[PDB]
Each structure stands twice: as structure tokens, then as C-alpha cells.
Symmetry: D2
Subunit: 218 residues, 4 copies
Amino acid sequence: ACPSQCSCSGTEVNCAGKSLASVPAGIPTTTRVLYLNSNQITKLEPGVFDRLANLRELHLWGNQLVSLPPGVFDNLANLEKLWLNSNQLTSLPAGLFDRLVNLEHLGLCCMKLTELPSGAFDKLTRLKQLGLDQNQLKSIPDGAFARLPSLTHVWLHTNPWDCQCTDILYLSGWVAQHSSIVGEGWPWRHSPDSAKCSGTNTPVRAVTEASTSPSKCP
Amino acid sequence: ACPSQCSCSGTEVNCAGKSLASVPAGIPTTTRVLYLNSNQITKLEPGVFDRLANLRELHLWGNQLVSLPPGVFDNLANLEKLWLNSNQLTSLPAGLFDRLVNLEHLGLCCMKLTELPSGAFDKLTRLKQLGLDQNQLKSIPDGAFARLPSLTHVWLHTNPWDCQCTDILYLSGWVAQHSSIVGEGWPWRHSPDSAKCSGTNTPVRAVTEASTSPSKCP
Amino acid sequence: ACPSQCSCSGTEVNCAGKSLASVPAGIPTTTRVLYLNSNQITKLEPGVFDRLANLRELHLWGNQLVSLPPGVFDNLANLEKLWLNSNQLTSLPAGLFDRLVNLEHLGLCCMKLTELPSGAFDKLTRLKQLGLDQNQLKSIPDGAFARLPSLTHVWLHTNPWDCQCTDILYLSGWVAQHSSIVGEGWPWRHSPDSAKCSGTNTPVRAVTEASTSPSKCP
Amino acid sequence: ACPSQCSCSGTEVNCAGKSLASVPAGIPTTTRVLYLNSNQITKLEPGVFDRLANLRELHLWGNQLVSLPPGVFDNLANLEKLWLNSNQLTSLPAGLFDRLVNLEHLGLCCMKLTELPSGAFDKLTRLKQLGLDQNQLKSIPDGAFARLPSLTHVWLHTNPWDCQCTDILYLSGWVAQHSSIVGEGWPWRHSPDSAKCSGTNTPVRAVTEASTSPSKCP
Ligand SMILES: CC(=O)N[C@@H]1[C@@H](O[C@@H]2O[C@H](CO)[C@H](O)[C@H](O)[C@H]2O)[C@@H](O)[C@@H](CO)O[C@@H]1O
Ligand SMILES: CC(=O)N[C@@H]1[C@@H](O[C@@H]2O[C@H](CO)[C@H](O)[C@H](O)[C@H]2O)[C@@H](O)[C@@H](CO)O[C@@H]1O
Ligand SMILES: CC(=O)N[C@@H]1[C@@H](O[C@@H]2O[C@H](CO)[C@H](O)[C@H](O)[C@H]2O)[C@@H](O)[C@@H](CO)O[C@@H]1O
């Protein structure tokens, strides 16, 4: 069992760099590590992974995804690493990650996200590493990181953070307090000022309530 | 806290690419993932990892190691991934890996290994992935892979296999039998003929007893 | 979501000691630890566990199972502990355990096993503990423990080992050499002579070929 | 190697029921599961476990410990189950459990604890099961369970909860809210009214602020 375009042995399936335009059929049920990265996949069918309950790592980075079906990861209860970096997402459905209670690494950089849904990470009690850098994020919803007790590495740089708007105060206070975990590069390197306000290029960590106004919020 | 040159958060310590000449002091005891790769480390003190029992991943690839103290990994009972690729090793001490009973990935490519000690891998019951490519190996000892029952991926290419000598018959037989797991690249791709006789450019797995002679052994 | 008769919280489902005659419906898909022991279950529906792929521990001990459907554990790739002790089995279907590649504890004591299928344990590479005591075993198939390299604990006592028959020599030779792992009790206690010949009270590990004859075998 | 009083194979050491008055010498450094239960151990040397970094399960239950040195569990970073049930502890040093970031079951029942230290469980992010039943507890410190996001099973019965005192209100409000995880027996069975006020036999989760007064707090 192995899609003809891929290499498969043991519990690892390598479909990387194969000019794939869709997720191939015949990925074994027993697969733990799935490389689908660096292809030209433009969409996921709902249910494409329903059958792949055993996955520990899902590598989807460097594809062309423009949206993700709601529920698409819902059977992945064992998933430990989810790499979605360098796709073309502009948003994420609510509840996307709620079933990924064992997730330890989540990569969401280098796309075009304009916001995150309000409860996006609330179930990710084991999450350690979270990559949000290089998107179009202006704010982080209030409380968004409050249920991430295992978090030790985060990436926030290269987002047009809107520091004139009162919405930024959650993040700006959070970064000030969790400043040892804010970084850049791969693997992570400590970089606490790397989250910067749009237009002023000043640190998000240094924004005050005085310098913001409800009137600056869209 | 953290070695001065490195970034540390959670249980991950990143000292990669820091022009290091030795293994820095102050790596916390709780470290699980240690990146020491891409430096200019020339040697390891005996005992350097004795206080790092919690390591799961040890990235030592791309350094200048020429030998390894015997027993240097002996405390690493939880070690799951050991990357020694691209160092300058010409041999491995006997018993080097014997304590590593939970090892799942072992990278030994791209150095100058001229042989393997006879029992090298006997204890690695859980080893899934083994990289031996790009060395100076002419032969594998008889029975060398017999006690690697969990092995699903192996790299053997780019070694001067000496197929005129009768010693090559263990390996040639083994490769023919375990064809499905022999490969190339990162991540692994199926490539069972990548192991070639030096010169004749015949695949190792196609060698017959008839073409070999004990008189051609060094 | 929880069977009415059971208690459920997190990923543990306790249906133990509930006077059940069958496996109840409504066991969540996310269940990792499933207690069905100490009931009056007499049989399993084929497919009963097809949906429970996240199981790590399956406690079926102290029921009244007389047979097991083939393929019944086939979807349990993450299974780590399987406890079938004190049921009423007289045999096991071929390949019953083949998909259980992560299995670390397998209990099969205290039933009515007359034999084991030839390759029963061949895939259980990570098996550490195996309980075969208190059955009706006369011999172990030649080679039956050869593909159990992770094995550190085994129980063999209280079986009518037929020491007149030459088939016992696999076992007797194996025990003599793996003597440190043979034992008794819960948790295990070292007990190398506990496995004894039927009628003679002679330890199985001391049997000689001189006392046995192919003429006394099946 | 094994202590002479005990039985050992693989990574399990069985010193249970051996009339031990102290922790014996010669427990291997590679030990993962250590049974020191049902002995007559009355204290632990500071540093006794410093060398046992690989422990996953520590069974210390049914001895006669009266105190525990602070720092004693500090090197047990991999510890997943800690069983201290049925000793004679009346208090726990502050920070006792702070290094046990991977602990999933903690048994503290059936002793003489008269209080818990304020931040006792603050670091136990993965704690799933916590046994506090059968002690001398009158209240639980404010916020004590707030940093146990993984907690799915708790035992609180058979404690003389002082419901007349305002200090009970954290606990009563907590039990009402987390009612589905409150239980009894082994394995856990659901039993939310099992925690009862002394004298009144009123479930703790049913206490009102009106029935309590800061004047009844000694
Ligand atoms: C997408 C890419 O450029 N490379 C991948 C790595 O990317 C990094 O991810 C972290 C965490 O999400 C962070 O956002 C970095 O800025 C980003 O480069 C990483 O996802 C790995 C996973 O193994 O794959 C690519 O190398
Ligand atoms: C630059 C280098 O050596 N690459 C490392 C990766 O490499 C490969 O390792 C596999 C497994 O042994 C095989 O030998 C390949 O030929 C080799 O390129 C891989 O080990 C990663 C994991 O950290 O490290 C480097 O990237
Ligand atoms: C009576 C019974 O089946 N007890 C179960 C325990 O039994 C021990 O199991 C081991 C290994 O199979 C060995 O066979 C012993 O003889 C037997 O007593 C044990 O399996 C536990 C596991 O949680 O369940 C019952 O207690």
C-alpha cells in the first residue's frame, strides 16, 4: 500500500517534492509520519484524513492551500506535530484544532492570515511551540494564549500589529510577561522585541493603554 | 539558565551555528532536545553528557569530531534520535551505542568510517532509521544487522563497497532480502540499487558468490 | 458520551465489575484506557474494537470469553497493554496479535490454552512482559519466542509441559538460556524453575534430549 | 544488578513486601518502574533518588514515612506515576512536586495530611489523576487546583471538611463546577457527593456562602 508517487516503509510516508496537486489515495491506515510538503496541493477534501487516526506528524508545509475544511483534523487524536507553514491561508475555521489534545508543535507562519478565530488554541493543553510569524495579523484575541500552559516557544514577528487599536493590549501585555519565549528562526532563537507595531516599527511589548484608542479599531 | 551563546526555553537548548569549539557549560539537566550542530566542535570530554540523562534528541551533526570517548552516551537511556552526520570520524568505539536501547534514529553519514565494530548495533532493538551513507565502508560485518528488528529505513549508498571480496556477501544477501527499506535522501526515498559496488557499478544486492573470492580481501 | 453502566472521564472508561454480558455501545472513539474486566462477557462481536484505534490499554481479564474473532485487535495499532487473563479460551486465531506492534504487556494466563499458533508473537517486537502461566500448554512451537527481542519478563508455570516429547526441547533450551526473565507472581518475581514437567515435577529447563523421544509427540 | 533483597529484570525492580527498613543499595540507574511498597521504610535520605533519573513509576505506598525531604523528587523529570498512599505524612514540604512536570497520576490518600501547601500542584500541567481521600483535610487552599488543566479524576472523600468556615468556599465552588471528575474506588468511579462536610454529612459541593462565616475559621 503506497501511492505510486510516494515512498513508504514502516510507518512513514514520503510524498514530498512530488508536484502533487491533490492528496493521493492509498496512504496506509498505520501511517505515523506523513510528508506532503513542498507540493502544489490547492485543497483538502473533507474527510481526507478521517481514516489516518494514527498520525503523529503531519507535514503540509509549502503547498498552495487557500482554505481548510472545518473538522478536517478531527480524527487526529494522536497528532503531535502539525506543519501548515507557507500555504496560502487567509483564515482558519473555528474549532480547527479542538481535537488535537496531544499537539506539541503547531506551525502557521508565512501565509496571509488576517485574524485567528476566538477560541483557536483553547484545547491545546500540551502545545509547546507555536509559529505565527510572517502573516497579516493585526491583533490576537483577548485570552487566546491563556489555555496554553505548556507553551515554551512562540513566533510573532513580521506581522502588521495594529498598536493604535485597543485590541492590541492583550498581546502587548502578554508579550511583556512571556518575553523569554518569544523568538525567531529555526530552531527557535530568543528574540523578545521581534514583535513590532505596524508603521511605527516600535515594540508591541512597550505599547501603553495611553497610546491606544478604541477609535483606532476597525 | 542557558549557555551564554545559546538560546534556551522549555526543555530545548539551541547552540546551533555558533562557531563553538567545545560543548558549552550550563546546559540544564532537564534538556530533552539539544542542538549542537553546525559548529566547530573538535572533541567531547568524557562525561560531558553524564548529567544530561533526559535527552531525547542529540544533534551533533556538522562538527569536527574525529573520535568519540567510549561510554560517552552511556547515561542517555531515553535518547531517541542521535545525529552524528558530517563529522570526521574514522571509527566508532566498541559498545558506543549499547545503552541507547530506546534509540529510534541514528545518523552516521558523510564522515570517514572505514569499518563498523562487530557488535555495534546489537542492543538497538527499537532502531527504525539508520544512516551509513557517504563513508569509506568496504564491507559490513557478518550478522551486523541481525539484531535490528525495528529497522524500516536504511541508507548505504556512496560507500566504496568491495564486491570482489567474499566479505561483501553478508551485506549483498541482506540488501536483496531487505530491499524495501534501502533508500536515499532526506526524508528517505526508496532506492534499493543505490548501494553500488565500487567501480563495476553493479548494485550490491545483485552480487553472487561466483563473482567473489576470498583472495580479494584486505 | 459514555455507556450507561460505566463511569467515564477524560480518556478512561471504567466498565469493570458491572455484571456485563456483552461489550456496551457508546465507548468513545477517544478512549485510551478501557476497563472491561471482571464481567460476564461470553463473546466479542467481530469489529467491536474497529472504531477504538486510540486504545493504549485493554483490560479484558476475568470474563468468560471462549473464543476471539480473527482480526478483532487489528485496528489497535497504539495498544500497549492487552490483558486477557482468566477467560475461558481454548485457542487463539492465527495472526491475532500481528498488528499490535507497539504492545509491551500481553497477559494470557489462567485459561485453557492447549497450544499456540506457530507465528503468534512474531510481530511483537516491543513486547516486554508475557504471561502464559496456568493454561494447558504441553509445548511451545519451535522458534515461538525468537522474534521477541524486548522480552524481560515471562510466566510459564502451572502448565502440563509434556517433557516426554521432543517438542519440549525448544522450550527447555530457551528457558535454560533466558533464565533470568522467568518468574511468578504479580508483580513478577524471579522464578526460573517454576515451569515444571507434567507428572515429574522436574524443571523444564533441565530436560535433556536423552529423556525425550519424537515417538511421544503429536 | 539488583539489591539482594529484591527481584529485577529489564527495567523493573521489585522490592515489594520485603520488610525493608530503608531504601536498599544497588537499584540500577536504568530503573523505570520501582516497587518499594508494603515495606517498613520510615524515612528517605535526601538524594536517595538523585541518581534514578529514569523513573516513570515510583511505588512508595504502604510504608511508614512521616516526612519527605524537600528536593527528594527533584531529579525525577520523567516520572509519570507517584504513589505515596498509606504512609504517615502529616504535611508535605513546599515545592515537593515542582520538577514533576510530566506526572500524570499522584496518589496521596490514606495518610494524615492536615493541609496542603499553597502552590503544591502548580507545576503539574499533565496531572490527570489526583488522590487526596482519607486524610485529615479541613479545607483546600484558594486556587490550589487552578493550574491542573489536565485533571480528569479526583478523590476527596473521607476528609473532615470544615464547612462552617469561609475557607471551604474555594473547594465547594470547585467541586460543584468540576463535579464530573469527582469520584471513588479503583479504578475511579463517578461519585460527586462523596466529599462530605463533617457533622452535617452534607455534600461539600452543596455548601452556601450564607451557611459559612469567617468567625468559624480557627
Ligand atoms: C515553512 C518553512 O519555511 N520551513 C519549515 C520550518 O518553518 C518554521 O516554523 C517555525 C514554527 O512554525 C517558525 O514559524 C519559522 O519561522 C518557520 O520557518 C518548520 O515548519 C519545519 C518543520 O519541520 O519545516 C520547514 O523547514
Ligand atoms: C547536512 C546533513 O547531514 N543533513 C542532516 C539530515 O541528513 C541526512 O541524514 C539521513 C539519516 O541518516 C541520511 O543519512 C541522509 O543522507 C543525510 O542527508 C538529517 O539527519 C537531519 C535531522 O536533523 O539533520 C541534518 O539536516
Ligand atoms: C487473576 C488475574 O488474571 N489477574 C490479573 C493479573 O495477573 C497476572 O498477570 C501476569 C501476566 O499475564 C501473570 O500471568 C500472573 O500470573 C497473573 O497473576 C494482571 O494481569 C493484572 C493486570 O492489570 O490484571 C489482573 O490482576
